[PDB]
Symmetry: D2
Subunit: 498 residues, 4 copies
Amino acid sequence: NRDPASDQMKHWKEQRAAQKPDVLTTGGGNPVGDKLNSLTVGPRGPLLVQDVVFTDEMAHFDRERIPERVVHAKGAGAFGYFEVTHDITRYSKAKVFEHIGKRTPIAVRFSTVAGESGSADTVRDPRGFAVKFYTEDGNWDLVGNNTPIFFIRDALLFPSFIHSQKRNPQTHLKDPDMVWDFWSLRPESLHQVSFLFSDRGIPDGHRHMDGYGSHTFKLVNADGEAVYCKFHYKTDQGIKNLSVEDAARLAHEDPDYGLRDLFNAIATGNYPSWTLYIQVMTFSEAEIFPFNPFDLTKVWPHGDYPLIPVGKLVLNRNPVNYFAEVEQLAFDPSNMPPGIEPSPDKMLQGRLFAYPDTHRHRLGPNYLQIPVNCPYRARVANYQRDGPMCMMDNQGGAPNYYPNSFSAPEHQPSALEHRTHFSGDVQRFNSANDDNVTQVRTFYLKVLNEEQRKRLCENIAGHLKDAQLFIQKKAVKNFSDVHPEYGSRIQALLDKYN
Amino acid sequence: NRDPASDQMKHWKEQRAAQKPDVLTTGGGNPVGDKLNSLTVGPRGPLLVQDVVFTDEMAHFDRERIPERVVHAKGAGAFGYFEVTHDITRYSKAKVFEHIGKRTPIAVRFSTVAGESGSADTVRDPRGFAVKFYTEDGNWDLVGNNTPIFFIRDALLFPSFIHSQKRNPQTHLKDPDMVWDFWSLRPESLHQVSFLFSDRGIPDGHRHMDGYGSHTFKLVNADGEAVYCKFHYKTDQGIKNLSVEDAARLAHEDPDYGLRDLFNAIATGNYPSWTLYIQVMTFSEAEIFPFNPFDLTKVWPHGDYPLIPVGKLVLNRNPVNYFAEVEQLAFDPSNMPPGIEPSPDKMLQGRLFAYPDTHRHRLGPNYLQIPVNCPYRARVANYQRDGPMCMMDNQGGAPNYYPNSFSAPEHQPSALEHRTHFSGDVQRFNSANDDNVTQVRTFYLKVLNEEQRKRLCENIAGHLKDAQLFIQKKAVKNFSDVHPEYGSRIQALLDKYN
Amino acid sequence: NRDPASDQMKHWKEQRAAQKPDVLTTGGGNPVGDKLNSLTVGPRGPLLVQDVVFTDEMAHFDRERIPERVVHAKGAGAFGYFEVTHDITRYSKAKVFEHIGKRTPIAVRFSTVAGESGSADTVRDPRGFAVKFYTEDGNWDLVGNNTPIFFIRDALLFPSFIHSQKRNPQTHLKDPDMVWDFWSLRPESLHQVSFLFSDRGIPDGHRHMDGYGSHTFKLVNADGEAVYCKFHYKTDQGIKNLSVEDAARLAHEDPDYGLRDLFNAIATGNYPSWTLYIQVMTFSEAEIFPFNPFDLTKVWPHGDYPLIPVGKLVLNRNPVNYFAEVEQLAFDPSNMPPGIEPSPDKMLQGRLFAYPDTHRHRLGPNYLQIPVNCPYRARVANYQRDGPMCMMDNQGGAPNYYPNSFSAPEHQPSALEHRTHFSGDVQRFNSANDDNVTQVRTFYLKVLNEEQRKRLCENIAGHLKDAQLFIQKKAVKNFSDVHPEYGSRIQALLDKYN
Amino acid sequence: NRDPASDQMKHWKEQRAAQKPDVLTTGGGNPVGDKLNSLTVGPRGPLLVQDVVFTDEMAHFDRERIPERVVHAKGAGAFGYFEVTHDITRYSKAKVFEHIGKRTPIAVRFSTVAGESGSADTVRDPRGFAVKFYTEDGNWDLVGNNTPIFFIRDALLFPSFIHSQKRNPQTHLKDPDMVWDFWSLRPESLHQVSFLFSDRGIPDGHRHMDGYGSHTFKLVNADGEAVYCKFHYKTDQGIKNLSVEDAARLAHEDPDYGLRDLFNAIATGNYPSWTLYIQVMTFSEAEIFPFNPFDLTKVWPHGDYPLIPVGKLVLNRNPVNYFAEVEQLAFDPSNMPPGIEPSPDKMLQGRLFAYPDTHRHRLGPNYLQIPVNCPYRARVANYQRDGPMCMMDNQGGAPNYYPNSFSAPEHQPSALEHRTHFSGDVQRFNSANDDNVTQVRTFYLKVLNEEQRKRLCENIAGHLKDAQLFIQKKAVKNFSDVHPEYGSRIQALLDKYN
Ligand code: HEM
């Protein structure tokens, strides 16, 4: 026959032998007699306002759409589980990790970054890979990308970054001057620019790309003891990338390529997994790391910070409803359960704010009650009330102020954050000048071959070629800074294009 | 001790000996260590952005308020049951009335009409008495008033109506120029104004007033035979109104008088009931009733159209949470299940549209998924999908187009509406010169005594007095028009004020 | 250099020599000192909550996206003028057509129909061609399509229609089972499907397609004499469609092809025009036209109803800001100023309600105050007040009730609608067995050549092939029903695919 | 005649001799023929969906209401100006203050705190007194109360505070156990509890109460030099309070008493003013102040910190439209122009967040474009775009990322915040135990007479009397702590009530 993606209504149906379709209602639950024909006066007369069946149905239609995500708008989702396989309770007291063999339920959204909802899957762009964990200590979202780094070290530049990757305010086209003005103007961006215009540019679907946490977390054990960390969840299926030729065909042949695959995998029983490691850096090594340990354009070398196994991530269940389980899934960085905790990373620090800020806009004040966003494996008791589209019992008749004499929830000191020490001037510290090439240099010299560097160049100018020549000049100079061959390999190409 | 409203937290607690308070969490379900102290650098330093407990709880606060009801904003609610006590099966094939002794669950909100949410209960104003029934044919909402009539016969004059009962666009004050300007310029308004300024303008609480459907519905039996009707739900508690001096006192002394009283009755075992009655009008009697049978400023005389008993309405359960079961209740008149159906009543035809329309504004697109507004005694199966705050499973992976070869829901013929014939010009018919006094005149000579007649006169004039003399002059003509003594009993008094 | 879309920022700048950049502010207008570095304690400390510049700008970001159009989501817009060139005053008393040479301002958005916002321009889909006119009798919106007909005759089947053109509720993929399931089960759908899979299914850009009002309007002259009509706005640029091979290429190569092209034409002085024409049908010819004159799956033959010229539509100004003048444009069909008026067209009667309904959802309650949607060539005076984002002075302190003794606005009789007589049963008339093939048959024998006939066949089958065989079987019967060779030219090909 | 509040439509009218009311339109700007009569078929037929005049009007009605403020919901507003009268440029470099005789425009909202929109003006409760300044350096809102202190020192307790002052979640009544549980449980609250149950409990309208900034600001001069400050704006009309007897009559006689007065003042030309002083505390005095200088329950003694004149606040213009100019006014603490700047005050620090957070909910993402909320006297240029109900030109075609090579706005280093030094552990520092009585003690002994203390007691128990006796016990103990007579004067009363 055909791929399971395609046999969907077929199976929905096959599955009800215990048929006799339900009665077609209105949302008030009144049964409908005719839904193919509006109520008029005379077969050729006008539409009656008493066709409250028309308006019901129509009123709902006209309301189906919610704003799509500010970035990362286009994606795939799926459910499965995390299971412990080694223990790191030395490092962390978090339940999710509390005992080898332990299994917590998880949801996952894969996506691109710049493209809007009708875009094509198979495009050069970073790639979200977000995991929500319904632990007992509440949800723990770990909002990762498929890259360990990023383009910038200060959240304040984010809007601008994102703006320049999207569309001209006047034109509504993608604009290379904007792409290339930004980037060449902020060279802290060359590390990930270098990752992206590489073969890892475009993965072969979600199942053949790694996931990272990117940021530096803080892990705290049962004694109050702290260490910094890095999360890496590697593909059990391997890497596998799509040539740029392959990628263009699929953009038109199957703009939704990655939903299809993800779907079909799981469905045919071919469950993707990933192995979660952690890098660990003590506070003192932190004090000596030749770079700012909390700098998104930076990786921790694994000769120095070898990886430590933690458990697996198994993807084994397809959404029944895309809208309700994928369009509406809300991942908040700030959903850190006792034992995990953010570091001083500038980028992390504004994600603390931004996520729940746009969820309250896109989904609504109470988006945490949407089925899939509910810490269901835990017990929410607090003094927050009311708000639009308030679903549950609103916590009934329970005292709503704190503190009170009437047995309402009470805080639990064991969940205090880790005491830590800060001394400084409240000022705005430059970061544009931290080291912008070193790590880039090596990447280019020792992590990637010769074809790979011949390609990474071709792809770079192949896009760059359409900025104005100044932007070109600036850009290559920067590239030139990281390694002189990086630069004149690119300048030569640019020449022949130009 | 005290009355039960007052002992609430005291009972909420007495009720948990299996205490040991729950753990206080964020909305993500993550446990909190200190909810009395924000997170800072040093005890006199600034507030960290990292205090994602502060922003969780505050973020929820700053978002607790939804718009109040455009009208009837202030109210009380409660749950109970409707119980069939006579059969009207000849008249209607509706499930709710299917067999003597049947009980259907019902919710009810009482409310006043023009005050905004912190106003006083005990003001002269009409009173809302809505009844939502959860039937097997979905919900059936009977958005009645405690008056059998109203001020107007065209929904088109409603906005205006209410605009003038509210406050001034410039001042935010209540204005008698606006009240009396409108009412005097539209004397169809005499019928209900006479009802409004008599003893029943101020019910002693909610329990001592009648509920009226006011509009003329149409009943359809199992043979396709329709008849016109009017619903009356009379109080088993008796009429009882508070003197205007009594009301002044309590408006200041206890703004919530009515809420307190309903809570307390039911809390102590004194459950209000109302007997539901129907007047019936054949299609024949209707081609001959001397007035528009469908005119909301008219009643059907009880010697002509005797009241027939239908069942009883008992209230026997208070809300746990007011916000979630009384503020979020949405009654839509268009929620009529098979055997109940709207008449050509111009005021009713406008209500068909407005209730859901504002419900999608106030509450949200999918406000019918609010536990309390859910037709939970029926099963919802349709082609409506998606939309903000989509709570259900959103009907899974079931075909969302109609018709379809795949066993998704089907319309049911036994639910077609009742066939009626209309002939005429598509035009806008005046209804301003429909008879404005007859019924009024009678009302004032034979319905109200002499005490009352002096009383309705003082009350009226006591408010009329503050308009501009032009306005009185015209207010009084109108009055003079229903009965010369009505007119001049009032002038008598207005001269003495003026 | 390059095409003008591409030189935008370059020109935005060349355009300010009176430079010296403005001071960068918050939204409160407070000047910013560093917008590249957030505020922290020490250079590696945490982010202060005090960085109210971070939260200002990020808070705005996280809130940039409004819902996209439920349909016709992807588009292009532009401004220009409509110019009377013949008089039709006999037919219509509308101000817009009042006198030869009159120019009224107009806006226009082109769009496709089923793709979401990042889709490709050049797909086979119908094409939207909306025209908003700013007349002295307020706005008049002509929400046309580039097709004179459509797929259905009852708005009630619309949700379904579109649900099946979109993607699967479970998969998020496009499904041929859904496409062909519906279309085969509703053959009224043959008329437009035949139009859709022929050469004109893919216009070469926006400039080379015709605009059609599709529905039958009704024109009312200054004597009260009405007539039925249809609007045709033909391209002065000529027809021109891209081969399906050409389209594949560009869907990948330039998703925005159409936007780019419209921008560029107008940018370079090549201003598109379309000639507007009206077919007229007396009320008489309508009691005898052999079909429902008001049936959207039918055209009025041009030998019977010749096209009469009305004026010209020129586009001659591009947007400054796309979000604000193209994404926020709201066209409502019900915006018809005196002398234009809806017919009993069941599809049109449903559109009367849906456009404003979704506009209040997407944009907001008061979306008609959006500069671009404002009837700026008229003066708005009514009793509507308040509501979210109320921008105007909200009509000051002017009486907000009607009627009133205080000189607030008054209704104007010369604007009453046109009197028509309707007689019949309030019922729901089938329209499914209205004639589904005649016009179709002709269309395929005499309207389309032999090349085209082979072509519309391959195209059709090329997509049909992916449905379940049942579905083809039935798809093909239908086809067989309009012409035996239509039916079997297709089977011929489907057998060879299958 | 009557008070100007009352002659409002009268004057609106009087004012158009240049009458002939405007034409009554629809919002699209189409003229209306009949607005008193819906469109039906037959004078007694049903409502046509083509009455797009009905739905327009009605659609808007149903949308008029926006959520009211979370607190401070009920109030009055007015416009006028601030003028400099002494100079403090030693202290501050802020333009508003830049030169004696200087005048900046201002808006003001007076309000209560707990009561919802229909509440009564004349009630014991603190009183908002908020001033918005349209300076050249953007707006400067100074969100003050009519008290120099507050009930709490940590924002985290705010929701809970507010909750307990409102209504029981179950009951919806005001609950003294909740009021008195909170307060007695958190004694840091006795300073302001002492202010509130005093004669300053209920002012005689807005014009006879002082305004304070309450919080501690930071003032920075042109050299980078800093000092801490306190803003006091004293009534030029004097104090004047309403006995509690007076206050109850007015609650029913004229729930809107304070709007009326405020209105009438200004209208009759009786412009209220207030004199703005500043207290100043150097950083070293800060280091030695026997208390936490940044503690809301604390005042700076004026023998020690005598007041320094700054300018006047003159109120001389009434709103033309309440909704648009008072309901929609948004005051943000965070609207601090270069020269003014927040201190480490815990309460201030969460107001930085909360205000704009709930404005984006209640009014909308773009509430800064609402006429009255617009920094109109300044020039907004930034990189923020889009968002719902986006009014202006959206900044046209101007580069939207930063930094860029194309002359888009640039930041201005002279607006850097003041460098300052913080050293600490990131922890949550208790504050419940800071001194809770001292200042209270003196208040009670030396700021208020003997009648005043006899009253302050009577009012206290007069309310307290309705909590349970435990709450009573706790409470008086606390009162007892501040001074033993405070306590047994209250216990005696409580006795006689109980
Ligand atoms: C953590 C401490 C506080 C928090 C979080 C807080 C929060 C809020 C909120 C959410 C509103 C509603 C605003 C709107 O919808 O536009 C509000 C209004 C207001 N607050 Fe507070 N409040 C705090 C303490 C105080 C204090 C100490 C004062 C006086 C110094 C004050 C003065 C006001 C005033 C006057 C308003 C009314 C705004 C208006 O009149 O438009 N707050 N506050």
